[PDB]
Amino acid sequence: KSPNRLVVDEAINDDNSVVSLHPATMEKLQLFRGDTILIKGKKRKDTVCIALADETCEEPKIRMNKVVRSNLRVRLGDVISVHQCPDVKYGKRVHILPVDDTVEGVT
Amino acid sequence: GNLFDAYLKPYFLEAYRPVRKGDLFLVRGGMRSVEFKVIETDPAEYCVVAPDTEIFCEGEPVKREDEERLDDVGYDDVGGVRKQMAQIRELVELPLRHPQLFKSIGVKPPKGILLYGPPGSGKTLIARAVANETGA
Numbered sequence: 113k114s115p116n117r118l119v120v121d122e123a124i125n126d127d128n129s130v131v132s133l134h135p136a137t138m139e140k141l142q143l144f145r146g147d148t149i150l151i152k153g154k155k156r157k158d159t160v161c162i163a164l165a166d167e168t169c170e171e172p173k174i175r176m177n178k179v180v181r182s183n184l185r186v187r188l189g190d191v192i193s194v195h196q197c198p199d200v201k202y203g204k205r206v207h208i209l210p211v212d213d214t215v216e217g218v219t
Numbered sequence: 220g221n222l223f224d225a226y227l228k229p230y231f232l233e234a235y236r237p238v239r240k241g242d243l244f245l246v247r248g249g250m251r252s253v254e255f256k257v258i259e260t261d262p263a264e265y266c267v268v269a270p271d272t273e274i275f276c277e278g279e280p281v282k283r284e285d286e287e288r289l290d291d292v293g294y295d296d297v298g299g300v301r302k303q304m305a306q307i308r309e310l311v312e313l314p315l316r317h318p319q320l321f322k323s324i325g326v327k328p329p330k331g332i333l334l335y336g337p338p339g340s341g342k343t344l345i346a347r348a349v350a351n352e353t354g355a
């Protein structure tokens with residue numbers, strides 16, 4: 113069990129791009145506060161998040177919210193891998209579209 | 220009988236009531252209500268009734284069109300329930316007068332209303348008045 117392998121946990125803050133870790137957890141992987149961290153999930157899915165240091169959390173556990181877990185196709189208490197990648201750069205154009213199942217009645 | 224002197228003479232007495240061709244009005248008397256439909260008038264479509272104005276009334280009664288009855292229950296046919304009438308109106312104005320809005324906002328409107336009281340207090344009357352006056 114490599115140190116970059118953790119167990120997901122429910123977060124107190126409901127931000128969709130914030131992941132809370134204990135400082136001791138980040139020290140083992142050279143992770144710093146406010147950096148950009150990649151997380152691999154199941155069924156070939158992965159996500160990108162930012163990190164915040166919370167002392168209430170414990171080393172084996174990593175805190176996320178419901179949307180990130182749904183993107184990663186994982187459930188609470190499952191095991192995920194956390195990596196770091198500095199290639200995440202500022203983008204010029206991002207194309208986003210809404211879902212038909214939720215935008216009914218609003219134009 | 221002579222419906223003229225029975226109903227129309229007091230109705231147009233001293234009142235310069237505007238009259239449009241094709242409309243209907245209600246006259247209350249003789250322990251009943253009578254609907255009169257205007258057929259024709261000299262000044263094109265609209266006119267003002269005057270003491271010198273001739274009032275023709277000879278002819279068979281007309282047949283009712285798709286227009287609704289004017290003797291049906293309304294908000295003026297219910298009395299003594301002003302607070303409850305206001306509550307019901309504010310509860311049913313949004314789902315009925317503006318229905319499609321609830322497809323947009325996504326908030327669930329009220330569905331079930333229970334009226335209770337002594338028998339003969341007018342629950343069915345209130346229900347019919349609310350249904351009729353909102354076009355439901």
Ligand SMILES: Nc1ncnc2c1ncn2[C@@H]1O[C@H](COP(=O)(O)OP(=O)(O)O)[C@@H](O)[C@H]1O
Binds near residue numbers: 296297298299300343
């Ligand atoms: N508040 C009211 N104002 C006017 N008429 C009323 C009122 N309450 C009852 N009535 C009269 O009572 C009659 C029958 O009452 P109904 O509404 O059938 O009783 P219930 O409410 O027990 O069903 C109606 O024709 C109506 O004219």
